[PDB]
């Protein structure tokens, strides 16, 4: 019970009615259900077509271009639950271009567990606005219902009750009625039970039901199982000895084992070697697990455990990265590989990531017209070619037209065995016979090769596999240039030497194996050690250099030549560049902070920064000029864009390439910020800054980077000190004496005196330094007699000072 019919897998029914009858009996589809591309079908064909026993769908339901279909109310009357275990592009119900379809009709569809619904381009579909997706879908924000007949209002969606007062089933959110067809309306359960389902009477179903049930509160009288299905009863979890299967039913070990048995050999495409783990008949053991053949359990494996991968007819072509992504992690390959990589970006390392785990190849390994492959080191773990599947001519290794191939495997560090078959190397210009013969010795295939199987005149050609050695003799460098010499190597026939070839590059790290290189050609010595003089090297840089000879293949035995070992030579250090971005900021009367960044060209390691600061005296003109004269200034010290960008950057670069060839100072060590001490208040300071990479042994380093700053002035440094003495002689001539602010902010530009008779108005008057020095102060005149007031304010470079306390004087009448 609980599922009267059988269970069917998924199907792709197309182009004919002769396959829809496959759902005659089964009540559950263990997969998806696609009915699409129905061109010749007529509406008369669906009148007598129904599958009332269909209840449950695991993956999804899809309809696309089915001509003549009008509604699914007759197709799947009892379709209840769509689990959505596997979604069609995040959609559990796709109805796309369902021409002639008028209404959905799936009135028994209570729940869609996972995914959303995509309904589109349905110019005849009605009854879409009167459906409650919130009561069916847990989250409806992923839906897609557009371009239907309900977009532009043309559907008369009327369902039973409207003539009687929209009765026979309620409405909810506007409070529009929710209903499926013109004769069947949606059944909505009360919120007292979330999704357990309820009968038509109103009483809720059992917790293990889903949507509908015949008897309330009965796990054996449901219609769908919320968690799992067993023996016609819905259960929370599968009890032993039954395992969870497909996340919807419980099966015994026998069923999973038998399914795996049919998947071993008697199914070529699409089967899953089902395994038992966590009491679940999972299709495949997860990562870090292996299958124990005794009971198919996913017993944990220590370290990298085998991941055998099968191949379509055991022959896979890998012409790019994407084909290699499939074979990721395959320790053992039960097939054969075809390598036809004609190019790629950042290969032999990412390719190593994809294909570096293969340890076994059942068939043959083939490399054909692989333009980009420079070496087979990406087969990091390959150790045995079984050679049970072979090509025509019985070939296990088949290398052909490999233009850039230079090295198969480092036989000093690699092992390889080939059980059956013979090698084949043709048209491998950059790979000489030494590597092939070494592989023949290593793999034990020496006794299998016959005539013309190995090409003796198309392989070891343009190959750089010099057997002898070149020893560098004289090497001494400079800050910009490096001189090199080596022993004069002469082949047995001195006419055979075309010259020498020198390779160098910037190699900060010594992990260079010559497998990008500036090449220099050198004429042979005139029968006097040959060498070259590098000219454009950056200072304090590590250069990897080796020397390879250039000989000619003689008609007699080939002279291989000699190549030097890869040596690393470091250029000398020189004067560093200007320390870029020097900024000085004053935050105190004696403290100024100096900040800078390391130079763009250290030309070594910056041992210490050298900082010079020199006091700048104030301008001479500030001492002998009157600043209250008519006309005065107060000395208050403190593709269009691309074209400009490139021109300005070139302008900056132009000058940057030009500069390449007793005062208080200090040496800043390993710091780029500095604060000076013991500075006079409000004094412009000239800071000369230098980066330096050597201190004691005849120090030589960069040119000065200049910046200037002025310290913060004191608030009360400009205050007037001493009494404001007044004096008269006879005729109301005021003679004001007052002491200077001996320590001002820079200097005192001028003084101003404000005087006002008792009850009268105030008049302003300036005092200049020349006037102040000559008159020892100020000498007022031409003012009325009586009692007055005197207020004095001192003006410095920082600004106006604080007015002194007012002083009164009374003159003789």
């Amino acid at each position: 019970h609980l599922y009267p019919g059988e269970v069917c897998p998924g199907m792709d029914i197309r182009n004919n009615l002769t396959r829809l009858h496959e759902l005659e009996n089964c009540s559950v589809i263990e997969g998806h259900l696609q009915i699409l591309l129905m061109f010749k079908t007529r509406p008369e064909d669906f009148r007598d077509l129904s599958f009332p026993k269909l209840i449950m769908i695991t993956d999804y339901l899809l309809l696309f271009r089915v001509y003549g279909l009008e509604s699914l109310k007759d197709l799947f009357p009892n379709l209840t639950v769509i689990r959505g275990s596997r979604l069609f592009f995040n959609y559990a119900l796709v109805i796309f271009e369902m021409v002639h379809l008028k209404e959905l009709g799936l009135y028994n569809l209570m729940n869609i567990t996972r995914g959303s619904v995509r309904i589109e381009k349905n110019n005849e579909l009605c009854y879409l606005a009167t459906i409650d997706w919130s009561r069916i879908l847990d989250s409806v924000e992923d839906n897609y219902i557009v371009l239907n007949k309900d977009d532009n209002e043309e559907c008369g969606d009327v369902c039973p009750g409207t003539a009687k007062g929209k009765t026979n089933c309620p409405a909810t959110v506007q409070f529009v009625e929710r209903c499926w067809t013109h004769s069947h309306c949606q059944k909505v359960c009360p919120t007292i039970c979330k999704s357990h389902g309820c009968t038509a009477e109103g009483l809720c179903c059992h917790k293990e039901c889903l949507g509908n049930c015949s008897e309330p509160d009965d796990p054996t009288k449901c219609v769908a199982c919320r968690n799992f299905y067993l023996d016609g009863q819905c259960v929370e979890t599968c009890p032993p000895p039954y395992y969870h299967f497909q996340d919807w039913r419980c099966v015994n070990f026998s069923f999973c084992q038998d399914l795996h048995f049919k998947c071993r050999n008697s199914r070529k495409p699409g089967c899953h070697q089902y395994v038992i783990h966590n009491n679940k008949c999972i299709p495949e053991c997860p990562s870090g697990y292996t299958m124990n053949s005794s009971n198919l359990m996913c017993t944990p494996c220590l370290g990298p455990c085998p991941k055998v991968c099968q191949i379509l007819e055991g022959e896979k072509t890998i012409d790019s990265v994407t084909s290699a992504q499939e074979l990721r992690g395959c320790t053992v390959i039960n097939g054969s590989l075809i390598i036809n990589i004609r190019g790629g970006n950042n290969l032999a390392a990412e390719l190593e990531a994809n294909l570096g785990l293969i340890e076994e190849i059942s068939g043959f390994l083939k490399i054909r017209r692989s333009y980009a492959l420079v070496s087979l080191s990406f087969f990091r773990k390959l150790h045995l070619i079984r050679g049970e599947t072979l090509e025509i001519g019985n070939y296990s290794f088949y290398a052909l037209d490999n233009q850039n191939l230079r090295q198969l495997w480092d036989w000093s560090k690699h092992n390889l065995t080939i059980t059956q078959g013979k090698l084949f190397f043709h048209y491998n210009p950059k790979l000489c016979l030494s590597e092939i013969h070494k592989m023949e010795e290593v793999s034990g295939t020496k006794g299998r090769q016959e005539r013309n199987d190995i090409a003796l005149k198309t392989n070891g050609d343009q190959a750089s596999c010099e057997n002898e050695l070149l020893k560098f003799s004289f090497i001494r460098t400079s800050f910009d240039k490096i001189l090199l010499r080596w022993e004069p190597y002469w082949p047995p026939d001195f006419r055979d030497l075309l010259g020498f070839m020198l390779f160098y590059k910037e190699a900060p790290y010594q992990n260079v194996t010559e497998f990008s290189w500036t090449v220099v050609d050198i004429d042979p010595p005139q029968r006097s050690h040959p060498g070259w003089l590098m000219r454009g090297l950056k200072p304090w840089t590590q250069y990897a250099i080796f020397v390879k000879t250039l000989v000619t293949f003689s008609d007699e035995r080939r002279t291989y030549g000699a190549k030097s070992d890869i040596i690393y030579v470091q250029t000398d250090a020189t004067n560093p560049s200007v320390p870029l971005d020097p900024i000085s900021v004053s935050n105190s009367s004696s403290q100024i902070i100096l900040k800078w960044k390391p130079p763009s060209d250290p030309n070594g390691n910056i041992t210490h920064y050298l900082v010079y600061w020199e006091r700048q005296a104030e301008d001479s003109e500030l001492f002998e000029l009157d600043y209250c004269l008519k006309g005065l200034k107060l000395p208050s010290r403190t593709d269009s864009q691309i074209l400009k960008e490139l021109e300005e950057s070139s302008f900056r670069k132009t000058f940057e390439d030009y500069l390449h060839n007793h005062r208080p100072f200090e040496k800043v060590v390993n710091k780029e910020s500095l604060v000076i001490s013991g500075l006079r208040h409000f004094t412009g300071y000239r800071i000369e800054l230098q980066a330096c990479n050597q201190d004691s042994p005849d120090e030589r380093c960069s040119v000065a980077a200049y910046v200037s700053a002025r310290t913060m002035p004191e608030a009360k440094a400009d205050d007037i000190v001493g009494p404001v003495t007044h004096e008269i002689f006879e005729n109301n001539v005021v003679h004001l004496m007052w002491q200077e602010p001996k320590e001002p902010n820079g200097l005192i530009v001028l003084y101003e005196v404000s005087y006002r008779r008792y009850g009268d108005e105030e008049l302003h008057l300036c005092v200049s330094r020349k006037h102040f020095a000559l008159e020892r102060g100020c000498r007022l005149r031409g003012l009325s007699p009586g009692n007055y007031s005197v207020r004095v304010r001192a003006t410095s470079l920082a600004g106006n000072g604080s007015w002194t306390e007012p002083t009164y004087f009374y003159v003789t009448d």
């Binding site: 240039k481 001189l483 000219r535």
Partner: peptide, 23 residues
């Protein structure tokens, strides 16, 4: 690359020196 000026004289100083150059 190209060498004449200070670069040329320092290049001659780098190549020779055990016996000396005149230029």
């Amino acid at each position: 690359q190209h060498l004449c000026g200070s670069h040329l004289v320092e290049a001659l100083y780098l190549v020779c020196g055990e016996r000396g150059f005149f230029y």
